[PDB]
Amino acid sequence: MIVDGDLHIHSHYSKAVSKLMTFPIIAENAKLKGLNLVGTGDSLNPHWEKELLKHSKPIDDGTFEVNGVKFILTCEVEDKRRVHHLLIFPTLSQVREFREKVKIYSTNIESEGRPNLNLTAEEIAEMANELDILIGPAHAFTPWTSLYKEYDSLKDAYGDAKIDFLELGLSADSDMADMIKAHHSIPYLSNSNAHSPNPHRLGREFNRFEVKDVTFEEIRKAIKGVGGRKIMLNAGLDPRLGKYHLTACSRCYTKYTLQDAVSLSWKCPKCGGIIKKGVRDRILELADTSEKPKDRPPYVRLAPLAEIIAMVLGKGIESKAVKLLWNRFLREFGSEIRVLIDLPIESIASVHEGVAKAIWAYRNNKLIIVPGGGGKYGEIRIPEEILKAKIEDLN
DNA sequence: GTCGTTCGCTACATGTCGTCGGTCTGC
DNA sequence: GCAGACCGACGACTGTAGCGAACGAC
Ligand SMILES: [Mg+2]
Ligand SMILES: [Zn+2]
Ligand SMILES: [Zn+2]
């Protein structure tokens, strides 16, 4: 069976997140967005474990279910060098063992969602492999809290340790990640690290797996690509829409080239901000080979349907008209990805014409995209001739 | 016209811990 | 005067009350 899953979210116990980020709301929004599997997130926090045991029903010893949505134990943690690490746990016993094992190395493990572990990345990965915990550098291209903002390679970060995946993130896709030779030997994950259960937030990037049943073991086999199970698709946000694609300032958000960045010494001239190196320039710095493996699954660059509706209606992202249109679209059809890629333009025009034309322009890549960097998301704008024209004379 | 309804932009939070300037000290 | 110790502020890790102001069925 084919299942879509987003295995990287943060509960309300994390900081700068939404208080509506609870199990029922997440399950409802995922079921409405056509999302089969959702990672628990913040599984190291005991209060979140209590809420999970209260609101959900167990499938086995590591897979749970609520409102028809499956859940696997996941958690993002922080490093002593301030590096994000995503972990997937087989069962709840592994969760409790890993928790009690690091209580002496942390002070907010029973207080925060993404906590602070005073341990080397090598030590964390070794402890994870000891208990067969899946571990990977989450959004490892961010110039703030990632791996490549601190280290230059995975071997220098983990040493004698072994990882199980590598989360790409918003500002990256499979090609630029595969531009590094070592990355050829590691499966990718297109996750969200999302904080709000909003349409454009929850499940902005997910992974489509082929499995036999919906359990942790099948997900592990699909990640490792064994026994017929495999990660057959990586649905992700366009890198130009991420918050740190290009190199820009952290205050004025002015885009600067890598050459101009080195010239100004990371000092913003007309602002004074601390310009941070985008993921594109970082990947270009760590350029290995122009080749990429064949077994790499395809990465479909998609945009949030909510933002498309907002830019078509000329209204905000959180407005009520765009919410009504999004709800009507999700009622008439299946999920966001269906209307974005799979659904034909003529069927989309049955609900709204301008939205169908914008989706056509996005599929044919005639949609204007201004990249984002330094903390600002990329923006999308449709040309005038695409909006004023009909549909038959379009293609 | 009328007054509920909604839009879009500004401000602000919850805390841990680095980075980044500025300041004190003891020489 | 200056190296080193000390200090404060600043923001990610974004989401959202909230607040005038334009809006839209009667
Ligand atoms: Mg992406
Ligand atoms: Zn993170
Ligand atoms: Zn600046």
UniProtKB/TrEMBL annotation:
<protein>
    <recommendedName>
        <fullName>Phosphotransferase</fullName>
    </recommendedName>
</protein>
<dbReference type="GO" id="GO:0046872">
    <property type="term" value="F:metal ion binding"/>
</dbReference>
<keyword id="KW-0479">Metal-binding</keyword>
<dbReference type="InterPro" id="IPR016195">
    <property type="entry name" value="Pol/histidinol_Pase-like"/>
</dbReference>
<dbReference type="InterPro" id="IPR018527">
    <property type="entry name" value="Rubredoxin_Fe_BS"/>
</dbReference>
<dbReference type="InterPro" id="IPR005287">
    <property type="entry name" value="CHP00375"/>
</dbReference>
